[PDB]
Design a protein around this nucleic acid. Structure first.
Ligand SMILES: Nc1ncnc2c1ncn2[C@@H]1O[C@H](COP(=O)(O)OP(=O)(O)OC[C@H]2O[C@H](O)[C@H](O)[C@@H]2O)[C@@H](O)[C@H]1O
Ligand SMILES: Nc1ncnc2c1ncn2[C@@H]1O[C@H](COP(=O)(O)OP(=O)(O)OC[C@H]2O[C@H](O)[C@H](O)[C@@H]2O)[C@@H](O)[C@H]1O
Lengths: 249, 257, 249, 257
RNA sequence: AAAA
RNA sequence: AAAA
């Protein structure tokens, strides 16, 4: 899915870090307009990431977009999820006018919010990830680099919410893995360039085919077979690895 | 699995037909001046690839027993089969009773009798084409891993599709099966509509048949930018598409079959 | 994609630097009028690079050209993107008249802008380039000099926005590389004279043919194949190199 | 790859035809007093170029099976083929049954038998021109890298064009393959319309067939300032133009195929 | 055939 | 044949 970030320049340090963590989870992140950019793709367009902070709400030009974003979210095109840089209690709610205060209280009452803090980085990042992926289909755990049996490999982990998906779910999915592959070693991307990529997690075989197929001539693809709980190679794009090698997981 | 053909031109009419049937079943076929740029002919063509090299096709016929040009070939083929490099499977063009055994010498007759007794054979008859073809295909696939039924040109829900059917003998395979397999599917797709090949050019291909996920991935992977790939899912029993290489075909729709 | 710079003589030092950096990215750049060559070429003419500066806004004989540029820009023949020498806050807007100030606010708000600073040169230049290539087809990263396996070489890096292009895209492209090859060692051009040039980056083979073909009898052409990740030489216009030699990654 | 033709004038009618067909397939065809500005006859031409020198096309025939002279060169070709510099592809103008073996001496007969059994040969018949021509083309291309089918002149969407087919045996080539290739396109480009050559002058040329991008670039690059170049992309199966050397043809248009 |  |  897509995810746009709305923020102030003061919290850029946190914004870039959360952006990097999200991009590590195979979600399209665009920062730099954003409101006319909303009407694009399918009804499953994206989710709005609003980063609420004390110096942030003092700017009206940081607020008109969110006002009209609520206006266009009531029609169901997009959904907003607010991020509290500071806790609810110490938010400067006095400075704003009456209408601003009521709209903010409505947005933090009728709409579920999650809180972010710098001290608990791991917990805050996990909470924003889960509260961001609560209303969506199969997840995508962040890429982890693990060296198995002397062979370097990066593994993408996905978990199915529930036990089944609609048979035509692939039609309405808006994620394609082609643009999430690094082209150069120096370039930063969710998937390391030329580094073997493995598939992990239970799921229907057609989703496995859809994930593995676009990787031709880009990276060698490993896949997990739970019958014996080991990795299996299907593509030989790097010398020294043949299709059929097994990695003791 | 490769297959080297030994025959005579008097049987070319049936050799071409059996070759076409085998090629429609995802099997590498090799006839006269064919491929393997090595020594060539056939006898030195045996020694290439993995221990699962091929299954010899000795098209025995009443007139085949002449022309020592082929009997020496069969002799060397069995000699190197005794080492286990290749396994011979004979095809009897005519029924066993009316083979002109008297024409052969004593040594040739003894060799042929030993071959036809120790080693199983397949009877072939022009009259019953489909049963003989099924018999020879099943005999070829008998001592092998997951089979491959002939590609079938079927029309589903208004869109044209070809399916590749594979059945697993038993219900499990060694986890390192893919290492020793001698089938590379990317060479069996035609580049032009008129060119004859196991897979029609640009026609969507669907994988059907129960099996492990890694086999499915290895089979759908080399098809990228060649043919739109459909996949059969047994949970609700309709084909599932994972490529958009042809106009009007998007990844995700269903074909109720 | 051509690029027309309208600016003042005061910031000419940074104008020339941004010009050189842009030219290094295979972007056609013209400086020395600017209003009437706008009608030339194809519908994709260029994007106007109007240099917004505090000294610039006091020059009405440089305001008029921007006015006519925007007047034509309603029709969509050209589009203007502004570069901010100073931060948006410290502009001298009060001395401006009512109509000109309103026009400046309209263009600054309804149209996205980008901010430049003399200190952080690298990130500012990267942002300028990204703003240039936002709405365009396949990108073009700046040419870099790398000696691979003891052989001098420059790589032309191009990135596909997304994973597919229109099949008839080549018809409407406004880039031919024949004008971007140096004819003399002294003459400064994006492609240095007689040195090997390589094409690196994923893309369809027809684009590779189009980008390699005009190079005949000009420079030895290298190419990168990602199957095993080494460069491949296809043309030998210089001694010591043969078609078929490899450069290890 | 090169091809040297050894024959007799009694078979010139078919020799010129097969040579023309071969030249249509982008292979170097050398005949008497025709090429090699650094030698003469046919024998010492072998010591030239790379280890992939050429394949000897010995046009065996009943009238050829004598012409004493021919033998000396046939013997030398075989003797230096034992070193592996050249290969011999014998062409039987007549079937081997009516080959007058009795006229030859014991040494010549023994040598002919040895070369006929140990080395693969191709039968040629006047009646089946297409099949025999395809067979000899396959004989040429069997022990080589990516092969070239004959150039076909086809009009697509009302636009004149020719296509150079090329198919890669197997699925991959050595990365350094381009170093050892003996095929350069420049030598096969016509200079005048009346001049006969594999590539017609100024006629648009289309590259079609699956292969690596570097091979595509190498095959298209020498075409600058000579002919308009078309490239086939399999994403939508349409021809794409990359050069505008003829009026009315801009780089970027598509040809529905 | 929903990690067989 | 969209870095095979
Ligand atoms: N396809 C055929 N073409 C020509 N003659 C044939 C063919 N099939 C059978 N015969 C005849 O039947 C006998 C076949 O033996 P022979 O071919 O002489 O010699 P070998 O056993 O060492 O095979 C040489 C190979 O090289 C070539 O590629 C051939 O096609 C072979 O595959 C002779 O009477 C043939 O004329
Ligand atoms: N290409 C040929 N053209 C004409 N006659 C030929 C040819 N090939 C064989 N013969 C006949 O084969 C017999 C033996 O002479 P030959 O094998 O020719 O000699 P060589 O290999 O030292 O080349 C000389 C050729 O080169 C010149 O270009 C001419 O064409 C010469 O023929 C004669 O009856 C020839 O007529």
């Amino acid at each position: 899915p897509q995810a746009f970030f709305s923020h102030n320049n003061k919290d850029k340090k946190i914004v870039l870090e959360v952006l990097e963590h999200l991009r590590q989870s195979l979600v399209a992140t665009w920062i730099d307009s954003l409101i006319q950019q909303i009407i694009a793709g399918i009804s499953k367009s994206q989710y709005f990431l609003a980063f609420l902070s004390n110096e942030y709400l003092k700017s009206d030009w940081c607020w008109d977009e969110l006002e009209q974003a609520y206006a266009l979210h009531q029609k169901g095109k997009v959904k907003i999820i607010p991020i509290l840089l500071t806790n609810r209690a110490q938010l400067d709610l006095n400075a704003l006018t009456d209408a601003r205060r009521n709209f903010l209280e409505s947005i933090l009452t009728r709409l579920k919010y999650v809180e972010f803090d710098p001290h608990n980085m791991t917990r805050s990042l996990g909470s924003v990830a889960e509260a961001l992926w609560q209303n969506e289909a199969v997840r995508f755990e962040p890429i982890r680099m693990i060296k198995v049996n002397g062979t370097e490999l990066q593994v993408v982990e996905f978990k199915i919410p529930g036990s089944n998906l609609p048979v035509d779910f692939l039609h309405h999915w808006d994620l394609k893995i082609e643009d999430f592959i690094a082209t150069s070693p120096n370039e930063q991307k969710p998937v390391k360039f030329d580094v073997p990529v493995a598939l992990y997690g239970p799921g229907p075989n057609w989703l496995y085919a859809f994930l593995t197929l676009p990787f031709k001539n880009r990276n060698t693809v490993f896949v997990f077979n739970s019958r014996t709980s080991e990795y299996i190679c299907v593509y030989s794009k790097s010398a020294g690895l043949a299709p059929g090698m097994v990695l003791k997981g």
